[PDB]
């Protein structure tokens, strides 16, 4: 499913993402925007290391979810990567929460550093009533 901006903003707030481990809602919005375009079925195979990014937050199979074909991988979220491709984003959110519980926090996603860090991200949540 492709979420509309404010729809996603309100959904994430309801799932408790606002301020989770110090990360504001607008930052999560910026991340979802640049990672998937707010699309839950987005997948990206990385030919370089044989891992695949899944879902709205493009979570990587090498550490977070199990897809069986990624070599020397772990499954920290204890989820099949299939779970990160559902229209209902509850599992993707629970896994995103697990990712930021690691020392790097939101920095675990390089796209966040490139397109969100130190920028005015208010625009991603303006007018959404979230």
UniProtKB/Swiss-Prot annotation:
Its Enzyme Commission number(s) read: 3.2.1.17
Gene3D superfamilies in the cross-refs: 1.10.530.10
- Active-site residues, record numbering mapped to chain: 35, 53
Q: What class of enzyme is it?
A: hydrolase
Domain C-type lysozyme positions: 1-129
Q: What is its main location?
A: secreted
Fetch the InterPro entries from UniProt: Glyco_hydro_22, Glyco_hydro_22_CS, Glyco_hydro_22_lys, Lysozyme-like_dom_sf
Is Cell cycle found in the keyword set?
A: no
Q: Which GO terms describe its molecular function?
A: identical protein binding; lysozyme activity
Q: Which PROSITE patterns match?
A: GLYCOSYL_HYDROL_F22_1, GLYCOSYL_HYDROL_F22_2
The protein's location, in the record's own words, is: Secreted
Q: Which reaction does it catalyse?
A: Hydrolysis of (1->4)-beta-linkages between N-acetylmuramic acid and N-acetyl-D-glucosamine residues in a peptidoglycan and between N-acetyl-D-glucosamine residues in chitodextrins
Record key words, sorted: Amyloid, Amyloidosis, Antimicrobial, Bacteriolytic enzyme, Disease variant, Disulfide bond, Glycosidase, Hydrolase, Secreted, Signal
The cellular component terms of Gene Ontology attached to this UniProt record, alphabetical and capped at eight, are: azurophil granule lumen; extracellular exosome; extracellular region; extracellular space; specific granule lumen; tertiary granule lumen
Mind listing the GO biological process terms from this record? antimicrobial humoral response; defense response to bacterium; defense response to Gram-negative bacterium; defense response to Gram-positive bacterium; inflammatory response; killing of cells of another organism
Superkingdom classification of source: Eukaryota
Cysteine disulfide partners in this protein: 6-128, 30-116, 65-81, 77-95
Miscellaneous comment text of the record: Lysozyme C is capable of both hydrolysis and transglycosylation; it also shows a slight esterase activity. It acts rapidly on both peptide-substituted and unsubstituted peptidoglycan, and slowly on chitin oligosaccharides.
Q: Which family does it belong to?
A: Belongs to the glycosyl hydrolase 22 family.
Q: What does this protein do?
A: Lysozymes have primarily a bacteriolytic function; those in tissues and body fluids are associated with the monocyte-macrophage system and enhance the activity of immunoagents.
Q: Which disease is it linked to?
A: Amyloidosis, hereditary systemic 5: A form of hereditary systemic amyloidosis, a disorder characterized by amyloid deposition in multiple tissues resulting in a wide clinical spectrum. AMYLD5 primarily affects the viscera, and the predominant clinical features are renal dysfunction of varying severity, and intra-abdominal bleeding. Inheritance is autosomal dominant.
What do we know about how this protein assembles, alone or with others? Monomer.
List the protein's name.
Lysozyme C
Q: What is the source species?
A: Homo sapiens
């Amino acid at each position: 499913k492709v979420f509309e901006r404010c729809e996603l903003a309100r959904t994430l707030k309801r799932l408790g993402m606002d301020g989770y481990r110090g990360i504001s809602l607008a930052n999560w919005m910026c991340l979802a925007k640049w990672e998937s375009g707010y699309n839950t079925r987005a997948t990206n195979y990385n030919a370089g290391d044989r891992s695949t990014d899944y879902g709205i937050f493009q979570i990587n199979s090498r550490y977070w979810c199990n897809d069986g074909k990624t070599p020397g991988a772990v499954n920290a979220c204890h989820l099949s990567c299939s779970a990160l491709l559902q229209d209902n984003i509850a599992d993707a959110v629970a896994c995103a929460k697990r990712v930021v519980r690691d020392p790097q926090g939101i920095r675990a996603w390089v796209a966040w550093r490139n397109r969100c860090q130190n920028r005015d991200v208010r625009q991603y949540v303006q007018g959404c009533g979230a």
